[PDB]
Amino acid sequence: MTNIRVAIVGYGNLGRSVEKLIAKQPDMDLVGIFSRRATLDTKTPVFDVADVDKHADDVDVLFLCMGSATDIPEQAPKFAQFACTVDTYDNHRDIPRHRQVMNEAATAAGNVALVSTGWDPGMFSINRVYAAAVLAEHQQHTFWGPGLSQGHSDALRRIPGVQKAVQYTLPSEDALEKARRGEAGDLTGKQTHKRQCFVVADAADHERIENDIRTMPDYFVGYEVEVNFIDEATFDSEHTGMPHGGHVITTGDTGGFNHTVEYILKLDRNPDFTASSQIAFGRAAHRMKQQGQSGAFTVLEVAPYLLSPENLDDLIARDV
Numbered sequence: 001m002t003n004i005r006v007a008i009v010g011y012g013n014l015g016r017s018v019e020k021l022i023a024k025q026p027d028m029d030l031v032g033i034f035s036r037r038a039t040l041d042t043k044t045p046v047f048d049v050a051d052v053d054k055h056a057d058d059v060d061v062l063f064l065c066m067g068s069a070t071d072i073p074e075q076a077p078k079f080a081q082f083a084c085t086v087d088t089y090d091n092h093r094d095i096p097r098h099r100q101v102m103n104e105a106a107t108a109a110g111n112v113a114l115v116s117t118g119w120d121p122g123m124f125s126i127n128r129v130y131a132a133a134v135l136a137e138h139q140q141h142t143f144w145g146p147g148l149s150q151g152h153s154d155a156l157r158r159i160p161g162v163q164k165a166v167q168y169t170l171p172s173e174d175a176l177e178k179a180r181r182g183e184a185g186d187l188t189g190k191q192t193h194k195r196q197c198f199v200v201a202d203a204a205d206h207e208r209i210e211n212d213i214r215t216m217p218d219y220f221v222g223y224e225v226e227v228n229f230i231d232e233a234t235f236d237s238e239h240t241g242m243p244h245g246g247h248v249i250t251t252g253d254t255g256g257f258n259h260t261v262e263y264i265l266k267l268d269r270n271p272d273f274t275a276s277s278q279i280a281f282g283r284a285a286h287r288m289k290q291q292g293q294s295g296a297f298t299v300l301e302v303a304p305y306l307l308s309p310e311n312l313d314d315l316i317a318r319d320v
């Protein structure tokens with residue numbers, strides 16, 4: 001058994017998660033980390049991202065863990081010419097373009113690029129397509145959370161007087177139920193999710209801050225909001241985590257008979273589950289290349305069995 005040689009590009013939250021999780025794999029060897037920074041807090045060999053071309057023959061798959069916002073769009077295609085790549089790119093409106101670009105790079109180099117893996121895009125995208133394909137006439141919605149929202153948290157932190165803050169996006173239990181019954185067709189995004197804020201500020205600024213939040217356009221205006229002014233000690237203790245998750249609910253009618261399909265994710269640590277998904281798809285990319293395949297693919301184009309470290313025969317005999 002020849003293990004798959006993998007490397008990590010970008011050492012942030014995701015990068016640390018995949019590094020830590022590769023040890024739990026029976027068929028993978030971490031060759032090193034390609035970073036823009038020289039000094040990293042790890043015993044794993046660190047290399048300059050500029051020297052990827054010099055290790056092209058020591059690596060089978062590159063786990064791209066840089067920022068989706070800017071890094072991915074411009075850097076990703078370059079790495080596809082050196083080995084199979086796996087990213088968790090999440091800009092939905094840019095995925096078709098990303099795929100086309102990654103496909104040209106991967107095809108030319110003869111590698112396989114797995115784009116937009118993770119839980120969303122990723123696992124949620126898969127369930128969305130499966131549930132919609134099965135239930136011809138259907139209604140579908142995806143709720144996010146309970147979970148930390150980085151975008152909304154930043155809006156909170158930029159309010160004058162806020163020392164520390166975090167906001168959790170929580171799906172409205174009322175909206176979830178309606179969706180399960182198939183009566184959520186007419187619900188706005190303003191009523192499917194609730195917003196919970198935890199702010200650390202001087203008691204004298206509480207009245208204003210609370211009002212700034214409730215009237216903040218786009219972010220909180222029109223939503224059910226709940227503000228909590230906690231002690232710094234309480235914040236550091238129970239609000240320095242990265243939890244997340246969500247629900248993908250699909251309902252359908254088969255002639256006077258309703259069917260509900262619900263996929264739920266409860267993650268204690270977002271980067272850990274994302275890394276787990278990315279890794280599994282890393283195994284799939286390698287396998288696909290072996291089978292003579294090349295190009296860029298989404299999670300919708302890989303047969304399920306490809307992500308598993310077990311042989312197909314064991315899977316069919318035990319899990320089908």
Ligand SMILES: NC(=O)C1=CN([C@@H]2O[C@H](COP(=O)(O)OP(=O)(O)OC[C@H]3O[C@@H](n4cnc5c(N)ncnc54)[C@H](OP(=O)(O)O)[C@@H]3O)[C@@H](O)[C@H]2O)C=CC1
Binds near residue numbers: 015036
């Ligand atoms: N599809 C999905 O379900 C999901 C996708 N994602 C995507 O995955 C990505 C995850 O990145 P994440 O680790 O959370 O974010 P970070 O910002 O922590 O990591 C981003 C990049 O910035 C760099 N950098 C990291 N830490 C530092 C630092 N301390 N000082 C200076 N530079 C640093 C890194 O590159 P370098 O080491 O080279 O400096 C790293 O690759 C996101 O962009 C998101 O779009 C996230 C969750 C889910």
